[PDB]
Symmetry: D2
């Protein structure tokens, strides 16, 4: 039962990250992010993104989305996003809670990526009608929930659509490092250079304990996010224990190394499974998330052998396999050999 591909949050934290917390719990520090360790992490993130920004460390990626969307969306506003996006399905209405009831309008798109024409139509729809909610913000997940990745030309176009229609762009980066490692571009080209204004920098699924970051590029919303982070109960007094994780998460490119390894194990797992006759991939994997089609008997037999994964959410035969930074080749190859015998 120890071989699981349900999610990347089942894994523990990196040894370098837990040791940073043990080295941080020394002496006294000014609470609520006014310490020296938090200032170093914000300055380090500025050099990584090659621009000025403001750090808002939060304990949950869902809170990183809800606080970000609340600073940009008025209660009468609308948040354009994908139907399968995380803010629309697996947050228990956390955006609707923080935005004081702003509506989330699902926009058509393939492979978890917003279609540019469908986004422009949704943005201009009923603009000027007092009887309708007004689209103000667009949310894109990078990497997407279905294991796909926006390319640089796909991100730049969405940003331009936001510019032309007066919309704000928020990037859900719970698996940000997986998309960055698969493209090899700089973090700036994948964020603010493409038009992203607020970024939900995710680190928990990539090796941290709970240290998530709201990376704000448009500092005009700084007062909003700061007040809304405290108002939501996400301003921790002993902040240095969340910035200790992020400091080790960014040191020596540990975050890039962890994400690269997770993407390799997923490509190895998808290669071994798609080679089977009765198994097919819904799309070639680009991150650490795999969506494949297996015969229904193969799903039940694999779960009966101890393998844990997510099924029966996206239809019949659809199985989601997610690797982590701590996934070993033995775990991947064992899952391949087990499904091969059933084939």
């Amino acid at each position: 039962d120890t071989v699981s591909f349900t999610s990347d949050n089942i894994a523990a934290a990196a040894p370098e990250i837990v040791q940073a917390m043990a080295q941080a719990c020394q002496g006294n520090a000014q609470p609520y992010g006014g310490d020296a360790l938090t200032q170093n992490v914000e300055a380090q993130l500025k050099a990584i993104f090659e621009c000025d920004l403001q750090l808002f460390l939060v304990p949950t990626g869902s809170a990183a989305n809800a606080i970000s969307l609340a600073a940009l969306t008025p209660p009468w506003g609308a948040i354009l996003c994908h139907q399968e996006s995380h803010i629309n399905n697996d947050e228990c209405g956390a955006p609707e809670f923080f935005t004081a009831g702003a509506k989330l309008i699902a926009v058509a798109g393939t492979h978890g990526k917003l279609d540019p024409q469908a986004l422009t139509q949704a943005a201009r729809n009923k603009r000027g009608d007092v009887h309708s909610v007004e689209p103000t913000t667009v949310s894109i997940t990078q990497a997407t929930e279905v294991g796909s990745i926006y390319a640089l030309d796909e991100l730049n176009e969405i940003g331009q659509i936001c510019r032309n229609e007066g919309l704000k762009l928020h990037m859900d980066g719970a698996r940000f490092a997986n998309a960055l490692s698969a493209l090899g571009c700089t973090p700036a080209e994948m964020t603010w250079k493409a038009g992203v204004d607020v970024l939900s920098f995710g680190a928990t699924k990539n090796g941290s304990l709970c240290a998530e970051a709201i990376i704000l590029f448009d500092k005009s919303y700084a007062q909003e996010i700061a007040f809304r982070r405290k108002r939501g109960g996400h301003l921790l007094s002993k902040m240095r224990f969340l910035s200790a994780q992020m400091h080790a998460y960014l040191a020596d490119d540990l975050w890039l190394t962890n994400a690269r390894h997770a993407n390799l194990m997923a490509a190895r797992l998808a290669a071994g499974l798609s080679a089977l006759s009765r198994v097919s991939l819904i799309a070639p994997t680009e991150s650490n998330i795999i969506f494949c089609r297996m015969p229904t008997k193969m799903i039940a037999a694999l779960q009966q052998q101890g393998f844990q994964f997510y099924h029966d959410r996206w239809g019949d035969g659809i199985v989601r396999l997610v690797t982590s930074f701590a996934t070993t080749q033995a775990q991947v190859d064992t899952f391949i050999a087990a499904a091969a015998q059933l084939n």
Copy 2:
């Protein structure tokens, strides 16, 4: 730099950070599905001598707002003290989670609620559709100024909530500091007095960010679970919040850390009150001291590297907060520096 500003400046106890290292191995079911979250819940059931449900949260203000949101309707009112944490230092976190409930201040001394004023506030404009209806009460134990409710005052507040059909929530951010001074069992300070939901605090008493919502009336379990997730306070890697709480309760570490913090405040106040120009404004009950000093003493102590809060309550008024990590040398140093400036 010797500081008595608050207990949130200290780190965690060495056992707390080490229990996370042991929990940092292997894979575990996320969002509280691990056996460690089940253990700390079963451990808290044995401590409070009753059945309960645990909801770990990162901050104590989140524990308050989530607890109050499960008990208070939007058209309801939360009866609390004027100087309470939920009414001042949360940026309207209760008003946010409760979908706009109204916090009504109730008169009282030393951050405590007066039973007469509470009864008059609970019965004000009952049945009137034009006014918000009182529904819940919030008390802080120990209070924001370090005062401690007696078990007899908690029973009276609890009986008022039963007579008026209200719900009782306790802000236990410094729960351990009040429990050690009373020497009573946790059950007598909570559900035996009538407390329905408890914000079990541990951060100030030696944890990194382990706060707990202790629900005694399990009829609100579905609302707390949904609102904690809806508010973004449901962490995936729960075993790292549970590992802090496991070491926090193991071998009575929380009772020892609190007894040490309360004891260090007693020595600091007794040594300062022995000075001619230094007097105590209120008797020290937990780990928060309120004393009066000469204005030159305050500036001279802050030039030497001593940190504390002063202007927030008056001229010459100085607040000193000791934590589990304040040493006997740090207490005697601040006293000797004040004695020289005397």
Copy 3:
């Protein structure tokens, strides 16, 4: 000009404005304490053949938002059609009153929910703390596309709500148009089918602004009474909202206005459908008609002075809505003008 945009452009019925002048004499107890508001409620108890509770509101959007808010928790979900009014033309009024409840669109043909698609959306991710919990269903009768739920279709939805622990709300802004086309009793259309709260619409059928929240499950009476006051929908001089509803129901005037509106729509649809280039999306059931016209014909009718809503649902799709004041000459003028354009 001759307009078929909506039935809210119409005047007030002469009997409605007459009743307001008959009620502007003397004093009366405010906020519904008068004898006229109590008479209108008792008059509705006899019409619906059951005990109920009346909550007069100035707007049908508020009637939907207040009703759904009393039934939905903030972490809950409202199951409705994609083209429903609460999901399109209320500026998030349900999301506002419900403190951010998520409106989930359920598949359905001709603006009517599919029973098999509704039962799947209710069971979907039940027990998942990460997902919003479906709590209520909202069906519009008559619907926005001009269709009408039959009695067997209303009872099936009511059974699915009872099977999945859901609460049923009925949007009845054009409730009378659906009742007159079926000829059944108001009880058979509402609570007998399983409806728990009804947005009884009267403005579009000849009233100025007297909308009514008819509550059959009186356990939510306290919620609605507090939420319409909390939303600013509790008028002091309510005897002038109940004066409209009294004349609205007097001598079956509301049934006479609705029957006339449906007959004028059947006349308009018959003449247009007989034309060569004009097609009906579906046969008309209420006072609302959706038809397909050539693009040149639409602009030509707009250039002659005729008013209707277009380019909101597609190319060539035109919505024509008749009112109680629509004359046969206005209808025959629109038929003759569109016929000349062929």
Copy 4:
């Protein structure tokens, strides 16, 4: 049968008000304020207040207060008002609901007014503190709930405080005309000349049915008030029947005449009572609201004779008497004669 002085909401409309809705009935009109009568009413208020403004007709004065405060106050903001204000007591948290949970902070003051020193102290309190809500808006009631009337000097002083502290000033004017008639000033001097940004122009208590007006002087919140009026359910389709009330309300100075009559019948009622030996006035009468002390037996006898009033909400023997536009000199003389016989 019963001669009541409970409030001015028990009365009906002026004859001109109900006759105006009958004339605005005939014909078809564009809904949701698109008709010509709603525009003409807005044009009249531009001439009455001698400035450019925007009109938002609402059914209740609580809706006028809550919608106005929601446009000015952010969710983390704070509303400064009096403890006994209508928004803090008799609206069932309507301001808290429309503002998405903004806090209402009570400011000390006498006769329902705000003290300038206590207001500056509440505005400067805990500025820049992220843990505390930030004061953003001020709300004053003219005339106050106890019938007291702000002077023009007191109104201008509060306005400069709002400008010195970056605050927005909203005025609750449910009995606006009662205060305007006694001061004898222009409507502009009472509102925007003193710094009022949005006004809850009240008319129901002065002879209307439900024609309450949100008058916006700072049209930067125009888009926000329109969205918040519709989102709250206060955008009526057949608005030509709310503006028809307001057209007759403003025609031929009917609103000034009704308010003067209400203030006159109150001054006559207070003069005849204070002359009696056993009933005294607690405060000088300024508008249509009176406060007087009576022995307990006189209250019970007046209650058994049919007279209606509030008698135990403020103290021992404290009786509040409220006159309206429909109060006659026969109704005033009858109440005084009955109380004189009891004396």
